[PDB]
Short mmCIF file of all heavy atoms in Angstrom, two decimals:
data_model
loop_
_atom_site.label_atom_id
_atom_site.label_comp_id
_atom_site.label_asym_id
_atom_site.label_seq_id
_atom_site.Cartn_x
_atom_site.Cartn_y
_atom_site.Cartn_z
N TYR Z 79 14.98 4.32 18.49
CA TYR Z 79 16.09 3.47 17.94
C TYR Z 79 17.12 3.02 19.01
O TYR Z 79 17.57 1.94 19.07
CB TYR Z 79 16.86 4.28 16.89
CG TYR Z 79 16.29 4.25 15.51
CD1 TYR Z 79 16.16 5.41 14.78
CD2 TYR Z 79 15.89 3.10 14.88
CE1 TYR Z 79 15.72 5.46 13.51
CE2 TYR Z 79 15.37 3.06 13.58
CZ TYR Z 79 15.28 4.31 12.88
OH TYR Z 79 14.82 4.38 11.62
N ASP Z 80 17.53 3.97 19.92
CA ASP Z 80 18.44 3.68 21.00
C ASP Z 80 17.93 2.54 21.92
O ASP Z 80 18.74 1.79 22.47
CB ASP Z 80 18.73 4.93 21.83
CG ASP Z 80 17.53 5.48 22.53
OD1 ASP Z 80 16.44 5.80 21.85
OD2 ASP Z 80 17.57 5.75 23.75
N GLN Z 81 16.61 2.46 22.07
CA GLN Z 81 16.09 1.47 22.96
C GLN Z 81 15.95 0.14 22.27
O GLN Z 81 16.27 -0.91 22.88
CB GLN Z 81 14.68 2.01 23.45
CG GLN Z 81 14.88 3.18 24.50
CD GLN Z 81 13.57 3.64 25.03
OE1 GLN Z 81 13.01 2.95 25.92
NE2 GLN Z 81 13.09 4.77 24.63
N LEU Z 82 15.50 0.16 21.01
CA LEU Z 82 15.34 -1.12 20.20
C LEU Z 82 16.78 -1.77 20.09
O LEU Z 82 16.91 -2.98 20.19
CB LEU Z 82 14.85 -0.76 18.85
CG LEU Z 82 13.40 -0.28 18.79
CD1 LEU Z 82 12.89 0.05 17.34
CD2 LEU Z 82 12.43 -1.26 19.47
N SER Z 83 17.75 -0.93 19.81
CA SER Z 83 19.06 -1.46 19.51
C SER Z 83 19.80 -1.96 20.76
O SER Z 83 20.75 -2.72 20.63
CB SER Z 83 19.85 -0.51 18.59
OG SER Z 83 20.13 0.63 19.33
N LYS Z 84 19.33 -1.56 21.89
CA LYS Z 84 19.79 -2.17 23.19
C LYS Z 84 19.20 -3.54 23.29
O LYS Z 84 19.79 -4.41 23.97
CB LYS Z 84 19.25 -1.35 24.36
CG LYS Z 84 20.16 -0.25 24.77
CD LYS Z 84 19.50 0.91 25.50
CE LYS Z 84 18.97 0.58 26.84
NZ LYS Z 84 18.81 1.82 27.67
N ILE Z 85 18.03 -3.88 22.72
CA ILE Z 85 17.34 -5.13 22.94
C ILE Z 85 17.90 -6.18 21.95
O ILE Z 85 18.25 -7.34 22.31
CB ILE Z 85 15.85 -5.03 22.76
CG1 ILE Z 85 15.18 -4.21 23.89
CG2 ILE Z 85 15.20 -6.45 22.75
CD1 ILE Z 85 13.73 -3.64 23.43
N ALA Z 86 18.05 -5.82 20.70
CA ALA Z 86 18.56 -6.70 19.67
C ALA Z 86 19.09 -5.92 18.45
O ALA Z 86 18.68 -4.76 18.30
CB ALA Z 86 17.41 -7.70 19.21
N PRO Z 87 19.91 -6.56 17.63
CA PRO Z 87 20.26 -5.95 16.38
C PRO Z 87 19.00 -5.44 15.61
O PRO Z 87 18.08 -6.20 15.50
CB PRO Z 87 20.98 -7.08 15.63
CG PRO Z 87 21.59 -7.88 16.75
CD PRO Z 87 20.51 -7.88 17.77
N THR Z 88 19.05 -4.21 15.16
CA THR Z 88 17.87 -3.57 14.62
C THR Z 88 18.15 -3.08 13.21
O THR Z 88 19.22 -2.45 12.94
CB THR Z 88 17.44 -2.38 15.49
OG1 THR Z 88 17.07 -2.87 16.84
CG2 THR Z 88 16.31 -1.58 14.89
N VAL Z 89 17.31 -3.40 12.25
CA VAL Z 89 17.38 -2.83 10.90
C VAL Z 89 16.19 -1.89 10.64
O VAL Z 89 15.14 -1.97 11.35
CB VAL Z 89 17.44 -3.89 9.79
CG1 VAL Z 89 18.80 -4.63 9.83
CG2 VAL Z 89 16.33 -4.91 9.91
N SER Z 90 16.31 -1.00 9.68
CA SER Z 90 15.33 0.06 9.44
C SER Z 90 15.19 0.34 7.98
O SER Z 90 16.17 0.27 7.20
CB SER Z 90 15.80 1.34 10.11
OG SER Z 90 14.79 2.36 10.11
N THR Z 91 13.99 0.65 7.58
CA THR Z 91 13.66 1.34 6.31
C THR Z 91 13.15 2.74 6.62
O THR Z 91 12.61 2.93 7.73
CB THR Z 91 12.56 0.64 5.50
OG1 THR Z 91 11.46 0.34 6.31
CG2 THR Z 91 13.12 -0.73 4.96
N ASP Z 92 13.29 3.71 5.72
CA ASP Z 92 12.79 4.99 6.00
C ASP Z 92 11.23 5.05 6.09
O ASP Z 92 10.69 5.73 6.95
CB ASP Z 92 13.31 6.03 5.02
CG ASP Z 92 14.81 6.25 5.19
OD1 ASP Z 92 15.29 6.22 6.36
OD2 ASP Z 92 15.47 6.53 4.18
N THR Z 93 10.56 4.28 5.21
CA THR Z 93 9.09 4.33 5.10
C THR Z 93 8.56 2.91 5.39
O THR Z 93 9.34 1.92 5.46
CB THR Z 93 8.60 4.71 3.70
OG1 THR Z 93 8.70 3.56 2.79
CG2 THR Z 93 9.49 5.88 3.20
N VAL Z 94 7.24 2.74 5.50
CA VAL Z 94 6.63 1.39 5.73
C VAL Z 94 6.17 0.72 4.41
O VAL Z 94 5.73 -0.41 4.47
CB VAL Z 94 5.45 1.47 6.75
CG1 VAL Z 94 5.93 2.16 8.04
CG2 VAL Z 94 4.24 2.15 6.14
N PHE Z 95 6.16 1.39 3.27
CA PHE Z 95 5.49 0.97 2.13
C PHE Z 95 6.36 0.50 0.92
O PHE Z 95 5.77 0.04 -0.14
CB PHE Z 95 4.43 2.02 1.60
CG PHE Z 95 5.01 3.31 1.26
CD1 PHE Z 95 5.57 3.57 0.02
CD2 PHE Z 95 5.02 4.35 2.20
CE1 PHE Z 95 6.11 4.80 -0.29
CE2 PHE Z 95 5.58 5.65 1.95
CZ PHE Z 95 6.15 5.87 0.65
N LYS Z 96 7.65 0.71 1.06
CA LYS Z 96 8.58 0.41 -0.07
C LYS Z 96 9.01 -1.01 0.08
O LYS Z 96 10.17 -1.30 0.46
CB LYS Z 96 9.74 1.35 -0.06
CG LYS Z 96 9.48 2.71 -0.70
CD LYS Z 96 10.59 3.70 -0.56
CE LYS Z 96 10.00 5.08 -0.66
NZ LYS Z 96 10.95 6.08 -1.30
N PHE Z 97 8.07 -1.94 -0.20
CA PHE Z 97 8.22 -3.37 0.05
C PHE Z 97 9.43 -4.02 -0.61
O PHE Z 97 9.92 -4.99 -0.10
CB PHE Z 97 6.93 -4.15 -0.20
CG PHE Z 97 6.71 -4.46 -1.66
CD1 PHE Z 97 7.17 -5.57 -2.26
CD2 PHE Z 97 6.07 -3.51 -2.43
CE1 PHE Z 97 7.03 -5.80 -3.64
CE2 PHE Z 97 5.86 -3.71 -3.86
CZ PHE Z 97 6.34 -4.92 -4.41
N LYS Z 98 9.90 -3.47 -1.70
CA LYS Z 98 11.14 -3.96 -2.42
C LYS Z 98 12.36 -3.72 -1.52
O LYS Z 98 13.22 -4.57 -1.38
CB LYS Z 98 11.30 -3.43 -3.78
CG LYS Z 98 10.11 -3.80 -4.74
CD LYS Z 98 10.29 -3.40 -6.20
CE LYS Z 98 10.40 -1.82 -6.38
NZ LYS Z 98 9.01 -1.11 -6.32
N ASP Z 99 12.42 -2.50 -0.97
CA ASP Z 99 13.54 -2.23 0.01
C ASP Z 99 13.39 -3.05 1.30
O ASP Z 99 14.43 -3.47 1.89
CB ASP Z 99 13.65 -0.78 0.40
CG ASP Z 99 13.86 0.14 -0.81
OD1 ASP Z 99 14.23 -0.35 -1.87
OD2 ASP Z 99 13.56 1.39 -0.69
N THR Z 100 12.16 -3.29 1.75
CA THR Z 100 11.96 -4.07 2.96
C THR Z 100 12.43 -5.53 2.64
O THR Z 100 13.14 -6.07 3.41
CB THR Z 100 10.40 -4.08 3.39
OG1 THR Z 100 10.04 -2.72 3.66
CG2 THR Z 100 10.20 -4.96 4.68
N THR Z 101 12.08 -6.05 1.51
CA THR Z 101 12.46 -7.37 1.06
C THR Z 101 13.98 -7.54 1.01
O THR Z 101 14.49 -8.48 1.54
CB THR Z 101 11.78 -7.76 -0.25
OG1 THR Z 101 10.31 -7.73 -0.05
CG2 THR Z 101 12.13 -9.16 -0.73
N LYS Z 102 14.67 -6.59 0.31
CA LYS Z 102 16.11 -6.67 0.17
C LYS Z 102 16.83 -6.55 1.50
O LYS Z 102 17.65 -7.38 1.84
CB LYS Z 102 16.66 -5.52 -0.71
CG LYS Z 102 16.53 -5.89 -2.21
CD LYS Z 102 16.86 -4.65 -3.11
CE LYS Z 102 16.44 -4.83 -4.56
NZ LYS Z 102 16.22 -3.54 -5.29
N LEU Z 103 16.51 -5.53 2.30
CA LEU Z 103 17.06 -5.38 3.70
C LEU Z 103 16.83 -6.61 4.55
O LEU Z 103 17.77 -7.04 5.22
CB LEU Z 103 16.39 -4.20 4.33
CG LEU Z 103 16.89 -3.86 5.73
CD1 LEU Z 103 18.20 -3.13 5.65
CD2 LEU Z 103 15.83 -3.04 6.52
N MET Z 104 15.69 -7.17 4.54
CA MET Z 104 15.34 -8.32 5.43
C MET Z 104 16.00 -9.60 4.90
O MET Z 104 16.51 -10.44 5.66
CB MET Z 104 13.84 -8.51 5.63
CG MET Z 104 13.19 -7.37 6.49
SD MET Z 104 11.29 -7.65 6.84
CE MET Z 104 11.42 -9.35 7.76
N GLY Z 105 15.96 -9.75 3.57
CA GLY Z 105 16.73 -10.77 2.88
C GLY Z 105 18.16 -10.82 3.43
O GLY Z 105 18.66 -11.81 3.89
N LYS Z 106 18.86 -9.66 3.33
CA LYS Z 106 20.23 -9.59 3.93
C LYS Z 106 20.21 -9.95 5.42
O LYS Z 106 20.96 -10.83 5.86
CB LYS Z 106 20.88 -8.23 3.79
CG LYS Z 106 21.81 -8.04 2.52
CD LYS Z 106 21.10 -7.61 1.24
CE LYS Z 106 21.30 -6.12 0.86
NZ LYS Z 106 20.71 -5.16 1.83
N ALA Z 107 19.30 -9.32 6.17
CA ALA Z 107 19.38 -9.43 7.64
C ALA Z 107 19.07 -10.85 8.14
O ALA Z 107 19.59 -11.24 9.17
CB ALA Z 107 18.42 -8.42 8.28
N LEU Z 108 18.27 -11.60 7.42
CA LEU Z 108 17.84 -12.96 7.83
C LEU Z 108 18.62 -14.07 7.17
O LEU Z 108 18.35 -15.26 7.36
CB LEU Z 108 16.32 -13.19 7.56
CG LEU Z 108 15.28 -12.36 8.42
CD1 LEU Z 108 13.89 -12.39 7.74
CD2 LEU Z 108 15.25 -12.80 9.83
N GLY Z 109 19.63 -13.74 6.38
CA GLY Z 109 20.36 -14.80 5.58
C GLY Z 109 19.40 -15.39 4.58
O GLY Z 109 19.56 -16.64 4.33
N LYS Z 110 18.42 -14.65 4.07
CA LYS Z 110 17.49 -15.15 3.11
C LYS Z 110 17.61 -14.41 1.75
O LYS Z 110 16.62 -14.11 1.16
CB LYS Z 110 16.03 -15.00 3.61
CG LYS Z 110 15.68 -15.74 4.84
CD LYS Z 110 15.42 -17.18 4.52
CE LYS Z 110 15.38 -17.95 5.80
NZ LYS Z 110 14.97 -19.37 5.54
N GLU Z 111 18.87 -14.19 1.32
CA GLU Z 111 19.15 -13.27 0.19
C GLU Z 111 18.55 -13.92 -1.12
O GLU Z 111 17.99 -13.22 -1.92
CB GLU Z 111 20.66 -13.00 0.08
CG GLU Z 111 21.07 -12.20 1.24
CD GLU Z 111 22.52 -11.64 1.11
OE1 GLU Z 111 23.05 -11.56 -0.01
OE2 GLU Z 111 23.09 -11.20 2.13
N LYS Z 112 18.79 -15.20 -1.27
CA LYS Z 112 18.26 -15.91 -2.45
C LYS Z 112 16.71 -15.93 -2.48
O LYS Z 112 16.11 -15.74 -3.54
CB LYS Z 112 18.81 -17.36 -2.50
CG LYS Z 112 18.35 -18.18 -3.73
CD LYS Z 112 18.68 -17.54 -5.07
CE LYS Z 112 18.62 -18.50 -6.28
NZ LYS Z 112 17.18 -18.85 -6.69
N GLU Z 113 16.08 -16.14 -1.30
CA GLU Z 113 14.66 -16.09 -1.15
C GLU Z 113 14.15 -14.69 -1.60
O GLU Z 113 13.20 -14.56 -2.38
CB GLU Z 113 14.19 -16.42 0.23
CG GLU Z 113 14.29 -17.91 0.60
CD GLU Z 113 15.74 -18.36 1.05
OE1 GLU Z 113 16.65 -17.51 1.24
OE2 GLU Z 113 15.91 -19.57 1.18
N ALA Z 114 14.76 -13.68 -1.09
CA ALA Z 114 14.48 -12.25 -1.42
C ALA Z 114 14.59 -12.02 -2.95
O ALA Z 114 13.72 -11.39 -3.54
CB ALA Z 114 15.40 -11.29 -0.69
N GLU Z 115 15.71 -12.52 -3.55
CA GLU Z 115 15.88 -12.32 -4.96
C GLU Z 115 14.84 -13.08 -5.81
O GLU Z 115 14.43 -12.54 -6.80
CB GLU Z 115 17.27 -12.89 -5.37
CG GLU Z 115 18.36 -11.83 -5.16
CD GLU Z 115 19.81 -12.45 -5.11
OE1 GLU Z 115 20.14 -13.24 -6.06
OE2 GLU Z 115 20.56 -12.11 -4.19
N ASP Z 116 14.43 -14.24 -5.35
CA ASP Z 116 13.34 -15.02 -6.02
C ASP Z 116 12.03 -14.20 -5.93
O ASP Z 116 11.29 -14.14 -6.93
CB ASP Z 116 13.16 -16.35 -5.39
CG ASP Z 116 14.30 -17.35 -5.57
OD1 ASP Z 116 15.08 -17.14 -6.52
OD2 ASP Z 116 14.44 -18.21 -4.70
N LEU Z 117 11.73 -13.72 -4.74
CA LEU Z 117 10.46 -12.87 -4.54
C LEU Z 117 10.43 -11.69 -5.54
O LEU Z 117 9.50 -11.45 -6.23
CB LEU Z 117 10.40 -12.33 -3.10
CG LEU Z 117 10.15 -13.36 -2.01
CD1 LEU Z 117 10.01 -12.72 -0.66
CD2 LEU Z 117 8.98 -14.37 -2.30
N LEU Z 118 11.51 -10.95 -5.60
CA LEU Z 118 11.55 -9.73 -6.39
C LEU Z 118 11.53 -10.03 -7.86
O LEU Z 118 10.97 -9.29 -8.65
CB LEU Z 118 12.76 -8.87 -6.00
CG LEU Z 118 12.82 -8.47 -4.56
CD1 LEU Z 118 14.27 -8.12 -4.16
CD2 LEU Z 118 11.86 -7.29 -4.32
N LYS Z 119 12.15 -11.20 -8.18
CA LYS Z 119 12.05 -11.62 -9.62
C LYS Z 119 10.58 -11.97 -10.02
O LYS Z 119 10.18 -11.57 -11.14
CB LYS Z 119 12.89 -12.87 -9.82
CG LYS Z 119 12.73 -13.53 -11.25
CD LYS Z 119 13.83 -14.53 -11.60
CE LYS Z 119 13.52 -15.26 -12.86
NZ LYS Z 119 13.01 -16.69 -12.59
N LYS Z 120 9.89 -12.62 -9.15
CA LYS Z 120 8.51 -12.98 -9.34
C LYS Z 120 7.62 -11.68 -9.47
O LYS Z 120 6.81 -11.53 -10.41
CB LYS Z 120 7.97 -13.87 -8.16
CG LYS Z 120 6.51 -14.25 -8.31
CD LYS Z 120 6.28 -15.64 -7.63
CE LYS Z 120 5.13 -15.60 -6.58
NZ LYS Z 120 5.71 -15.16 -5.22
N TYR Z 121 7.92 -10.70 -8.66
CA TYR Z 121 7.29 -9.44 -8.75
C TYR Z 121 7.69 -8.70 -10.05
O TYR Z 121 6.82 -8.22 -10.84
CB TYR Z 121 7.65 -8.54 -7.55
CG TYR Z 121 7.06 -7.11 -7.75
CD1 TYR Z 121 5.67 -6.85 -7.56
CD2 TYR Z 121 7.88 -5.96 -8.06
CE1 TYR Z 121 5.15 -5.55 -7.73
CE2 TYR Z 121 7.36 -4.75 -8.26
CZ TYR Z 121 6.01 -4.50 -8.07
OH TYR Z 121 5.53 -3.22 -8.26
N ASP Z 122 8.98 -8.69 -10.42
CA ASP Z 122 9.43 -8.03 -11.65
C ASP Z 122 8.81 -8.66 -12.88
O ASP Z 122 8.41 -7.97 -13.81
CB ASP Z 122 10.94 -8.04 -11.72
CG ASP Z 122 11.60 -6.98 -10.86
OD1 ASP Z 122 10.97 -6.04 -10.40
OD2 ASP Z 122 12.83 -7.18 -10.54
N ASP Z 123 8.74 -10.00 -12.89
CA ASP Z 123 8.09 -10.76 -13.99
C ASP Z 123 6.53 -10.36 -14.17
O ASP Z 123 6.17 -10.08 -15.30
CB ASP Z 123 8.19 -12.21 -13.79
CG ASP Z 123 9.59 -12.77 -14.05
OD1 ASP Z 123 10.52 -12.03 -14.60
OD2 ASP Z 123 9.86 -13.91 -13.77
N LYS Z 124 5.84 -10.35 -13.10
CA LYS Z 124 4.43 -10.05 -13.08
C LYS Z 124 4.23 -8.56 -13.62
O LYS Z 124 3.29 -8.35 -14.36
CB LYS Z 124 3.84 -10.16 -11.70
CG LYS Z 124 2.32 -10.35 -11.78
CD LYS Z 124 1.74 -10.67 -10.44
CE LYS Z 124 0.26 -10.71 -10.39
NZ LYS Z 124 -0.34 -12.07 -10.64
N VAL Z 125 5.04 -7.62 -13.15
CA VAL Z 125 5.04 -6.27 -13.65
C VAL Z 125 5.29 -6.20 -15.16
O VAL Z 125 4.46 -5.61 -15.87
CB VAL Z 125 6.07 -5.35 -12.87
CG1 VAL Z 125 6.27 -3.98 -13.51
CG2 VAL Z 125 5.58 -5.26 -11.35
N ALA Z 126 6.37 -6.85 -15.61
CA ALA Z 126 6.62 -6.82 -17.10
C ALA Z 126 5.54 -7.42 -17.90
O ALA Z 126 5.20 -6.82 -18.95
CB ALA Z 126 7.97 -7.57 -17.36
N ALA Z 127 4.95 -8.53 -17.43
CA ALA Z 127 3.80 -9.16 -18.16
C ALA Z 127 2.58 -8.17 -18.12
O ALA Z 127 1.93 -8.04 -19.18
CB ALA Z 127 3.39 -10.53 -17.53
N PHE Z 128 2.38 -7.52 -17.00
CA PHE Z 128 1.28 -6.52 -16.94
C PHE Z 128 1.45 -5.36 -17.97
O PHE Z 128 0.60 -4.98 -18.64
CB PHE Z 128 1.10 -5.95 -15.58
CG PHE Z 128 -0.03 -4.96 -15.54
CD1 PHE Z 128 -1.35 -5.28 -15.22
CD2 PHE Z 128 0.27 -3.55 -15.77
CE1 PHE Z 128 -2.42 -4.37 -15.17
CE2 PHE Z 128 -0.77 -2.63 -15.76
CZ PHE Z 128 -2.11 -3.03 -15.45
N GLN Z 129 2.69 -4.82 -18.04
CA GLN Z 129 3.01 -3.77 -19.00
C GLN Z 129 2.66 -4.20 -20.40
O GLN Z 129 2.06 -3.50 -21.20
CB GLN Z 129 4.37 -3.26 -18.81
CG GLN Z 129 4.61 -2.50 -17.52
CD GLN Z 129 5.73 -1.54 -17.62
OE1 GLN Z 129 6.28 -1.15 -16.58
NE2 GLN Z 129 6.07 -1.08 -18.82
#
Side-chain angles (χ1 to χ4, degrees):
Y79 276 134
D80 62 306
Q81 290 183 75
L82 296 179
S83 64
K84 273 154 68 158
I85 293 160
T88 297
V89 289
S90 188
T91 52
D92 292 328
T93 81
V94 307
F95 58 86
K96 278 174 204 212
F97 77 92
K98 300 185 296 284
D99 303 341
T100 299
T101 300
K102 279 171 194 158
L103 181 80
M104 289 183 61
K106 263 90 105 292
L108 293 164
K110 297 281 169 175
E111 295 190 18
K112 180 59 161 77
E113 286 83 10
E115 275 161 52
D116 293 336
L117 292 185
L118 299 158
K119 172 167 173 256
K120 181 150 125 270
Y121 176 75
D122 284 339
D123 287 349
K124 204 172 171 93
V125 169
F128 177 91
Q129 290 207 201

